[PDB]
Amino acid sequence: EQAMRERSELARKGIARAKSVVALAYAGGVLFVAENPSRSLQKISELYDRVGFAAAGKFNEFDNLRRGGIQFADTRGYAYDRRDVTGRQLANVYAQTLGTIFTEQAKPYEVELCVAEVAHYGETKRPELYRITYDGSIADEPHFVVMGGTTEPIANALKESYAENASLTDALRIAVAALRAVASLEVAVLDANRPRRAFRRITGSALQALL
Amino acid sequence: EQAMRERSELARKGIARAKSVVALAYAGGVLFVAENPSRSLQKISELYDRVGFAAAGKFNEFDNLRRGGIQFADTRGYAYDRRDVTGRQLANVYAQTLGTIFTEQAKPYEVELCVAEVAHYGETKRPELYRITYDGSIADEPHFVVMGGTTEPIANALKESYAENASLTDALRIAVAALRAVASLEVAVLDANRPRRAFRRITGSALQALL
Amino acid sequence: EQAMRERSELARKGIARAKSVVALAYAGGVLFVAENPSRSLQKISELYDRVGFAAAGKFNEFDNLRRGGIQFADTRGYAYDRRDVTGRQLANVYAQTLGTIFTEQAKPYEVELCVAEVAHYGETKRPELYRITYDGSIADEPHFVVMGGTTEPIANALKESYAENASLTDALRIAVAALRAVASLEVAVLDANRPRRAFRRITGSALQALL
Amino acid sequence: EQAMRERSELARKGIARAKSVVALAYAGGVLFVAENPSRSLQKISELYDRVGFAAAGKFNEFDNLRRGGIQFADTRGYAYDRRDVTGRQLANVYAQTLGTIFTEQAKPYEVELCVAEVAHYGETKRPELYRITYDGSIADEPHFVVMGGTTEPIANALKESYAENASLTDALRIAVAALRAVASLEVAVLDANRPRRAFRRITGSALQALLV
Amino acid sequence: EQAMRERSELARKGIARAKSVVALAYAGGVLFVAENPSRSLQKISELYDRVGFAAAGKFNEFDNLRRGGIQFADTRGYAYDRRDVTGRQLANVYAQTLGTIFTEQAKPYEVELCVAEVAHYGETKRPELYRITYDGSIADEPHFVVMGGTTEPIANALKESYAENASLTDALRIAVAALRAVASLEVAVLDANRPRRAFRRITGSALQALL
Amino acid sequence: XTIVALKYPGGVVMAGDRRSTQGNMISGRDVRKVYITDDYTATGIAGTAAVAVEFARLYAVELEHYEKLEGVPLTFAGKINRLAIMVRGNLAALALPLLAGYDIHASDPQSAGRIVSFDAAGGWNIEEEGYQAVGSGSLFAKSSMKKLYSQVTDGDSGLRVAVEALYDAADDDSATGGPDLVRGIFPTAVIIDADGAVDVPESRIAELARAIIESRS
Amino acid sequence: XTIVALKYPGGVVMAGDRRSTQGNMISGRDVRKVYITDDYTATGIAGTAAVAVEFARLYAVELEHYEKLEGVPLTFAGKINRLAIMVRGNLAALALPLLAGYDIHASDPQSAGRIVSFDAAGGWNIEEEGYQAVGSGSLFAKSSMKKLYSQVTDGDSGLRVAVEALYDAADDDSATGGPDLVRGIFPTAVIIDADGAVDVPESRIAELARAIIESRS
Amino acid sequence: XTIVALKYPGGVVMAGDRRSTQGNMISGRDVRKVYITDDYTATGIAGTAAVAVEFARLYAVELEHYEKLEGVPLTFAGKINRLAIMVRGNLAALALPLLAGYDIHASDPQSAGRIVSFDAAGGWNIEEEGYQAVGSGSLFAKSSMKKLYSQVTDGDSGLRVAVEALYDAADDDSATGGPDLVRGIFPTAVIIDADGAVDVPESRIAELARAIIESRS
Amino acid sequence: XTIVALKYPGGVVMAGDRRSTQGNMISGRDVRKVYITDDYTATGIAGTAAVAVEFARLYAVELEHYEKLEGVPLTFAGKINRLAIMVRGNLAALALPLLAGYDIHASDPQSAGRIVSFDAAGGWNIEEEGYQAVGSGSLFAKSSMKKLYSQVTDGDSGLRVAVEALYDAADDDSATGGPDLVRGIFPTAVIIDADGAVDVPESRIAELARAIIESRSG
């Protein structure tokens, strides 16, 4: 209707007004880099043992989702096995939730999520990345994902500067570069070489060296 | 009215923008072939012993339906006999569900379903295919079904190139051909020669051999 | 009203787009003939011992009603006597149900029902036919009922070609004739002779002979 | 209130399209005559021992009310005495129900009710007729009541041809006459003479007999 | 959206009509100073051990939130540890609440909140201030916060006159000054030198003696 | 107390004593335990005055309620069903009813009489033996009927046998009252025929009652 | 009371005694305990007259209900399932049913007979031994069939053995009724073949009754 | 009744007797107590015929239901979890299951075999001793396996030891049935390997039974 | 069964036997009763194999759940609180846990070890005596520690005393299992230090146990 395009605009605008975020998969695993001035409010987080989460947009809204995600994940793992929790599954859940909100609530969530999964310790498997958008539409890119602010300048910057399997420190530079289009950064990685919890946040002196 | 027409148009547009899917009856059983880049997100699925499911459109929505169908089937099978579950029945359910959604929810589901049934192990029976559309309208074609994207170029391609009772590898070519109008494919069959669980995905080398 | 005539139109239109159905009294008992392509989806059905049911319109909707009817009937029969169940009663129930839907739901059911009763084995009574319409209005014709599609051409055809206490083979021709205005047919009768369960469907080969 | 006027019209029109019904007091008791071809459907009914009910309009709706009336009456009779149930009372109930519907539901009931009460067998009392209309308004006429279809032709026909305390067979003619403005009839009477149940129906041998 | 803008204006207007409030970080903790004629109504309050709260706007509304905040805090502290309650957390909560109200209630709350946290007695940490606005947007300033009335004249006055790590009596003057743009004052400080309960109100001789 | 019911050619009769006790004490001499539920049916409960009425009252209302709603009366089976439902309803919430009725829809009017009783657990049962009895004297009454039933040929003899059976019950059981000639109180009875269910006049019962007594004096 | 069921080549037969007790007293001589639930199935309950009917009635309604809704009848497994669900339903609200049936979908029509019984705890059981019996005389009936089963070759012999087994049960168990020749009351039976379930005519039974008696006089 | 399971190099075998009792009475000789719930797992319950099926049926449904929903099967841990949840589910409403399974994801295929049993209170337990047994004859079965387990080297010897253990259980416990040579009824078994769960054919078990018997004559 | 815990300078060690009984019968020889709930904590329950896991699994999930939601771990007090809530929860709808943890936020790292036990009624209790034990052998184990605790100076001696206490428990209580040298099954242990909670390798425990039993008997 106009009831549906109007909403799609409100949302798409609010997202285009937020800080940008990037997720890319390096040889080591998935890397999250988002521009973030605040030192207490976070756009990147761990949802489960091998799956992480990054979002752009209105905080109170995407944080709320992050919690619900964790809620859901922890619950499945308990009711089944820990290995039931998958990027695939969580994304699916976020899609159905954003989809519902966009349809039935007063205002659509002005957010854009990325759920990233990495292979379990022993095995080999190509990192998966999912982008869920304000309307419940769910995409799955293979190399990188860009969210919030003005995406094209950054998506193009990566398209050309992107080498798969880049060491950590390499992929880190490519990302910060593509974002240009340092204590203002939130960085974290989904380490596929960790035994159980893959999420690990890079901060301070450690981050400076890779930087 | 005009509003209902608008809803229908929106659903059609949403569907006409998704990847295409094909289901056709072959001597071995029913074959499902859908164009699908993603390796973790699936448009074809098992429903019950002898009935499978393929959909096209917005994922979060048709997947949700896939789950509810499985939920429903598994329940009937327990509350009655395993042979109470039929393609006929499930399609009926999907019809009433999509019909309700299209009437009483905020946005119609942008999906198109196909429920296929094949004969039980022992007996002989002509495969049934059912197409349920965004509005609850339910059709039952005898030879093939095409959903999503631009259907005419593919429906015509089959009309002429369709041999009923083809071998598997034959029907597979005819389908991939009609789709033209390989690791970008999701393929699976409802083999009627299996004793109980008819659904069988074709992946990797086997699919290649079929190619 | 305006709300109320709008709904009355949506309904009356959807019904005028569906396949036509005919129910007429004959010496044997009531006869049901409906044009129906599908071999698995049914417009005619048993309800209780001596009462049958035929509908035209949107399937998911009228089927739903058929089930609720059976539900109600079987329940009354258990909680009272089997002879408490009457065409009169069930039509009444359908009336109050369609009446409610038309008033209180989002969309009126696009259906037209016929409930037919025939005399119990031993006794003599003249078969009763009831037409319940989308709005809960309930009529009780004495000779025949026509529903769905364009009714006038068929109602007129019968008015003149209708002989009461006609032979079933006879009545069957009259009906197929009036419908003109064979494996595309669903036929059934509510025969007086059956001791308890009057409903009987004519499958085809035996069906061909009546032709 | 234009909306109210509109609601009033939808109702008043639907009732003006239905078959007519007449209820008139006679020496024996109240008499109900309605033109009704359908043999299974019914516009006239018992409600309680000394009270009957007749309606005109859309069946599913007025039948529904007939049932609720019986429901209510049987309940009161059990929770108090059988003599607590009165025409007065039931009409009051129908009024409050039709009133509510007309206000709060999506569509007003397209109906017109008549509740008739006759004195108890031992006692002698004047018959009482009540007309409840689609909006909850409740009238109580003393001689006759006309509902459904075009009422004026019939109301006038009775005004002049009405003798109070007619014999049964007399009042029956007067009524069928006023209706003109035989297996197409539903007839029933409230009999004051009957010891407990006053409702009675006339099948047809008697009707032919009373019709001629 | 124009409607959303209208709600914001109604809210932004009502806030611009209320008395002004200031919160700034000083050497001994966080200082609250608000202009307030009333002697029984309060705009500044304790929330938990180390976190205080100040609001400007319509009383019945911001008080209600103050209570909700205390409710929530005291509950978390009991269900977890007393150290789970943080400024960060409570602000988050207020954001989601004002956010909800602004979306789903009839009128947006005409309020502006400040939640300030200070270091525990043992640890040394920089005080954190958070401003939550009528729409759920949450900011975190590092030095001072100004709410209600005409803010610019006061924000500028501080920008220039603001020395971080002022003594108490110093910061107090700077604040009262910036407000100009005495029994008409509500003053309190989050003293980080107190062992458990940090909130402390200064009234009468104490305010006086610092002037 | 004892209630008794038997089939005769063309009807049934049911009859019940008038006593009620509270332990050893006699708490009633006047008690009606048999009532006419409908035109063709009647119930007897071997219980307190109140139980017998309150139950019949409720049942009668149910039956008529259905008729007013549906235009016709329940089939006899339907009548039994509702009764049973009602009985099981009160056993979840030991007055076990005896229902006597006439089935007009029955092919043969000679044996259109019906007797239905209820067991300890609220299960109904149709009597094909021709007679039945419930209550404390039930055993003596049944065993007396066993011997006298051969003599039942019409409604009048049926009535005498029923009354004699109740006499025998009161004779061997102290909770069942016999005919009080001093006070002129006799068992109540009801007869159901094609014509309908009617209350048997006290005078007739007395005639039978007096006759049974000087017949054994 | 005792119900008995046995498979014969081409069908099953099921039969039940006509007596019912309330303690030591005989409360019934006429009791039907076996009913045909549907075209290809029948149930017997070794219980009161009412329990046996009310349960069959309910089950029969379920089965037909499903058929009207879905166009076809449940598979045999389905019928057992619903039965079991119904049984467990009543045990959370000791009448243990015996179900005899004919499976038309069965590959071999000789052994399409089916017998299903229920244990103390409402768990169903399929009988692969060819016969089965429930109720107080169940032990004697089973042990009698053990010896006579070799002689079952058609539906007529199956019927005799079934009746003899019930005669044996009544002979050693006082709660199970034998053939009453004085009153002409015999056990009820049902046979189920590929042609469906049929009630065996009381004439056929009192034929076998006298036969089985005269053969031990 | 006894269920036995043991691990051999490359799989597990699970086997169960066929008897079932109602007190002292033998109520079943045919009872299947071991069923396949999925491709790599099977459950045995030392209980009535109905309990053993109805339980496996439900579990098998859960497992497959999950697979249809999520594209893949549960991990073995997952399988055990749902089982345990299901068991605790029925105990808050004493049939204690024995689960035998093969974990494909296991690093070493030789010890891929799994045995899980449940204690009195519904708590699961993994067997690291190589064998396990539940039911009335469980003690004798385990003590026999203690002595014979050293001889297990492949699936075939594993199967013999399992059958001998069930022979020893039936030998010292009357509720556990031995091999009926007269009727030709033997214990049921199931074998699980990388290839998957498979029902062991009666042929081989009878072959083995006899050889155990003769080895002791 | 017996679980034992004791503080040493710089940590805690917690160890638990491997037996489980059903009356007089031995129903388990392999039972793990001590599990690591989180990075700085572990629980032992003197119960069935299943109870000990299912309880630890639940607790561990709660603790991590809180951390993912809130960004940081509960304070030690917080951890105890949730535990106790959980224990009281299960006594409404007698497996009494022993919690060993290390408090990183503690001022003094030498005595950052923590031991919390639960009484009959689900009330928590902090051990200031340095050791603690629960289960049927608990009395013997505690009385043995009383005499041996003086010798605890590092994590290694703390581990030996813990094992010797469990050996003494098994010696005087039949529901507690000793070291089975025939089968090579020994008590399980966990050591918590500033670095984190670690499972003690069966080898170290086995060595100590073997040392005590082999020397004790040739």
Tab-separated table of N, CA and C in Angstrom, chain I residues 9-11 35 39-40 47 56 61 64 74 88 104 106 112 122 129 147 149 166 172-173 181 183 193 201:
chain	number	residue	atom	x	y	z
I	9	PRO	N	46.800	-21.800	49.332
I	9	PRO	CA	47.202	-20.422	49.036
I	9	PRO	C	47.223	-20.194	47.533
I	10	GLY	N	46.289	-19.396	47.050
I	10	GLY	CA	46.233	-19.083	45.640
I	10	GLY	C	45.121	-19.771	44.862
I	11	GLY	N	44.364	-20.656	45.513
I	11	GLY	CA	43.310	-21.368	44.822
I	11	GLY	C	42.419	-22.212	45.697
I	35	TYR	N	32.057	-30.951	38.259
I	35	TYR	CA	32.099	-30.337	36.943
I	35	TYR	C	32.427	-28.866	37.015
I	39	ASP	N	34.337	-20.287	34.179
I	39	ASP	CA	35.777	-20.078	34.209
I	39	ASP	C	36.390	-20.116	35.604
I	40	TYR	N	35.720	-19.539	36.592
I	40	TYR	CA	36.249	-19.546	37.953
I	40	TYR	C	35.479	-20.376	38.987
I	47	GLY	N	25.639	-37.116	44.397
I	47	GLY	CA	24.461	-37.817	43.930
I	47	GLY	C	24.674	-38.740	42.734
I	56	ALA	N	24.927	-29.125	37.315
I	56	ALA	CA	26.017	-28.323	36.740
I	56	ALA	C	25.682	-27.699	35.356
I	61	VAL	N	24.741	-22.847	32.445
I	61	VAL	CA	23.990	-22.126	31.459
I	61	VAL	C	23.516	-20.823	32.043
I	64	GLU	N	26.541	-18.246	32.184
I	64	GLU	CA	26.931	-17.722	30.873
I	64	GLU	C	25.796	-16.879	30.266
I	74	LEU	N	28.719	-12.423	36.698
I	74	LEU	CA	28.220	-12.070	38.026
I	74	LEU	C	29.391	-11.914	38.988
I	88	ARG	N	17.044	-23.821	46.019
I	88	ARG	CA	15.734	-23.737	46.658
I	88	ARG	C	14.631	-24.081	45.644
I	104	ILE	N	38.082	-13.339	41.422
I	104	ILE	CA	39.137	-12.497	40.869
I	104	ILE	C	39.104	-11.081	41.444
I	106	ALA	N	38.653	-10.230	44.305
I	106	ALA	CA	39.060	-10.230	45.691
I	106	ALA	C	40.373	-9.480	45.818
I	112	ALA	N	41.691	-15.993	47.686
I	112	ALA	CA	40.613	-15.687	46.787
I	112	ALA	C	39.782	-16.977	46.582
I	122	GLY	N	18.434	-25.953	52.014
I	122	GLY	CA	18.743	-25.139	50.848
I	122	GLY	C	19.341	-23.781	51.160
I	129	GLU	N	36.656	-22.198	57.385
I	129	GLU	CA	37.585	-23.134	58.006
I	129	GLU	C	38.631	-23.673	57.033
I	147	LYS	N	43.308	-33.071	60.350
I	147	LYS	CA	44.674	-33.455	60.767
I	147	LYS	C	45.717	-33.174	59.705
I	149	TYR	N	45.407	-30.746	57.174
I	149	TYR	CA	45.333	-29.482	56.491
I	149	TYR	C	46.589	-28.673	56.751
I	166	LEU	N	39.621	-38.262	50.546
I	166	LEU	CA	38.653	-39.102	49.841
I	166	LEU	C	38.974	-40.572	50.036
I	172	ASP	N	36.104	-45.903	55.423
I	172	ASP	CA	35.184	-46.038	56.549
I	172	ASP	C	33.729	-45.967	56.099
I	173	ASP	N	33.504	-45.639	54.833
I	173	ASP	CA	32.162	-45.599	54.284
I	173	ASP	C	32.045	-46.403	52.988
I	181	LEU	N	42.571	-49.825	41.500
I	181	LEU	CA	43.789	-49.989	40.734
I	181	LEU	C	43.628	-51.028	39.619
I	183	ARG	N	40.949	-51.611	37.767
I	183	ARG	CA	40.287	-50.980	36.634
I	183	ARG	C	40.884	-49.632	36.226
I	193	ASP	N	42.470	-21.485	40.021
I	193	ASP	CA	43.488	-20.509	40.357
I	193	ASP	C	43.222	-19.217	39.611
I	201	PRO	N	44.392	-33.771	35.558
I	201	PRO	CA	44.645	-34.961	34.725
I	201	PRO	C	44.604	-36.255	35.524
